[PDB]
Amino acid sequence: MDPPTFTFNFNNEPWVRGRHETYLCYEVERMHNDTWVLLNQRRGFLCNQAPHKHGFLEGRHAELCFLDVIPFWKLDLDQDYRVTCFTSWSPCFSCAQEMAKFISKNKHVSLCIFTARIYDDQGRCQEGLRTLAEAGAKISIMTYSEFKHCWDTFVDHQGCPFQPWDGLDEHSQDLSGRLRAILQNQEN
DNA sequence: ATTCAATT
Ligand SMILES: [Zn+2]
16 A cells, blocks of 8 residues: 555545556455355555456556456356446546446446546537446445545554645535536436 | 546
8 A cells, every 4th residue: 555645546636646547446345145254354456557367458457457357256147246437527428428338237246437637628528428327327426424434444543644735625616516517407 | 517449
């Protein structure tokens, strides 16, 4: 575990050097119809670099790297599995449609994606976000309650204490406003 | 409010 990088990433407003690779964190849980098993005790990290075992490159997208990990865990179709994904960027557009198809072909898996922030290069992919919320698995903005879990789970709070600042609130203001516009415009 | 795959 390295110094509070998760916390640093949120306040990385000025640290925006302009040369950083995207890293995704993943979690896996085992659920049995007869019994439930919590594998939350174990956790792992994922990089935007696709692993060689996945085969040839399918495109240049951080979300695709996450998609490559699902088939590598060889999940049983007869057993239910809950997987979580933590990311700090917009859901994308073409990839957003791919995640919707994945759940449709696998509704037995509980998948939730948390976006720390959403950056739209141009106004047009907003429609994908609406579809993403319906089939793009459950998406929510990172909050203090979830942040403490990610902070304690991804980084050991022992020796590495996280100091709360009014930064998460400032970030929430942008996401709460932008996300509110999409959900608020939810046409009946 | 925010940054940015292959071979021996
Ligand atoms: Zn993408």
